[PDB]
Design a binder for this molecule. Structure first.
Ligand SMILES: O=c1ccn([C@@H]2O[C@H](COP(=O)(O)OP(=O)(O)O[C@H]3O[C@H](CO)[C@H](O)[C@H](O)[C@H]3O)[C@@H](O)[C@H]2O)c(=O)[nH]1
Ligand SMILES: O=c1ccn([C@@H]2O[C@H](COP(=O)(O)OP(=O)(O)O[C@H]3O[C@H](CO)[C@H](O)[C@H](O)[C@H]3O)[C@@H](O)[C@H]2O)c(=O)[nH]1
Ligand SMILES: [Mg+2]
Ligand SMILES: [Mg+2]
Lengths: 214, 214
């Protein structure tokens, strides 16, 4: 049964087409998961499932939609008692031999105990940064002077174990409004020194966000 | 009028020799700044200048020393009324024509007024997150499964304006004990556009940390 889910706004035609292209090109099955967007449904879900996050001003409603989308997929993994689920965001580009990693789960099943608490990142692992070209301050000795900003780290491609899905659901439900942070910080950065929770990284990575590739 | 300071533990003979080699090779003047290490001197400086950081258990005393070292150099920029100061950490490797940037300052003077609030990063901006090898779970299709151990950003090579030295001193003094993080993490989080503080990036970069080179 299919374990690959791609989080995507139902109306995002171009992204969905780019996702269909790449997955079918390598014969990798997947299903779209309709992303939560600023809407009655998202407001309602925040209220019932994560009231703490509803009251948090530090995240935009779009960031809250993305968070809700990952959260409800973790909940699907638990409710359906899946060993793991593999989640993507809809701007990913698949690397060369991605079919070997994503089309079948045997390689995971022989490696991991899925009751253990872990996430395996599939995407690139550079520190999350973006450059903005600017024209007003001229280059020197053939080097540009760009404007550097930080952004949130990627949650665009990962395998999550049933163990970690339970752990992250419990954690998100327990966080106070004040403790709410971007999904990547809670999932990755804030767990780096946790007892049971491991973050693994496929190295080299097998997928990359389109923006990150630039 | 020397602008270049290299943060280095006084006893780190090999790093200092590698720094002398590269800087003298390109005729770039510089001074070592004796890095603060776990010691009475560091404890004293933390107490006088950053009591908030003294009380932070989330950081090792070495991380506190590194932070104090950058902080006191920012303070020297202001106290000595330098236009800017250029800071390095002692594992840096200089690229080809670094002398054009580091031995002369007119290029900076014609681009900026030094009471503008900016940092210009000189080191690489593509920086992998820190991964740790593990042996208990075998690789698949020539990809390793590594463990995420930290997300550190480089503070090994940058120009800071007197404007930004004042801004960063004020910011560091204002952080609560709870908000204290390693210097690179704080500075990483300051790279945003909703500020008067700008971070520029030299592209391509002119230096790299030797460990990063892999
Ligand atoms: O209202 C929305 C808007 C977007 N998304 C979804 O969010 C995902 C990522 O979209 P983008 O690539 O446009 O956004 P980013 O890659 O910039 O988001 C990145 O940074 C975010 C914070 O700004 C998150 O923390 C996240 O880890 C990370 O992938 C997509 O699947 C998209 O469908 C929603 O679920 N709801
Ligand atoms: O007690 C100490 C130890 C080190 N340093 C200074 O810290 C700088 C960086 O030292 P290393 O490269 O040995 O430390 P890391 O290998 O940890 O360096 C990188 O990794 C760190 C992650 O913990 C930080 O992000 C740091 O800024 C980053 O450049 C050097 O100038 C060193 O002199 C001190 O001031 N005091
Ligand atoms: Mg993205
Ligand atoms: Mg270093």
């Amino acid at each position: 049964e299919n374990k690959n889910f791609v989080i995507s706004i139902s109306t995002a035609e171009q992204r969905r087409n780019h996702i269909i292209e790449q997955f079918t090109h390598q014969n990798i099955p997947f299903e779209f998961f309709d992303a939560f967007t600023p809407s009655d449904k998202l407001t309602d879900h925040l209220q019932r499932y994560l009231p703490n996050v509803a009251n948090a001003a530090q995240l935009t409603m779009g960031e809250k939609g993305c968070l809700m989308s990952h959260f409800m997929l973790w909940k699907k993994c638990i409710d359906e008692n899946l060993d793991y689920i593999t989640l993507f965001e809809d701007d990913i580009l698949l690397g060369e031999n991605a079919n070997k990693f994503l089309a079948e789960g045997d390689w995971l099943k022989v490696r991991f105990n899925f009751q253990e608490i872990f996430v395996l990142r599939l995407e690139t692992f550079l520190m999350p940064v973006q450059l903005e070209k600017q024209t007003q301050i001229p280059p020197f000795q053939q080097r540009d002077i760009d404007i550097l900003t930080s952004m949130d780290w990627g949650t665009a491609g990962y395998v999550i174990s049933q163990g970690a899905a339970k752990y992250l659901i419990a954690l998100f439900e327990k966080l106070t409004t004040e403790e709410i942070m971007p999904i990547d910080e809670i999932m990755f950065n804030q767990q780096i020194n946790a007892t049971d929770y491991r973050v693994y990284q496929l190295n080299p990575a097998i997928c990359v966000q389109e923006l990150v590739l630039n």
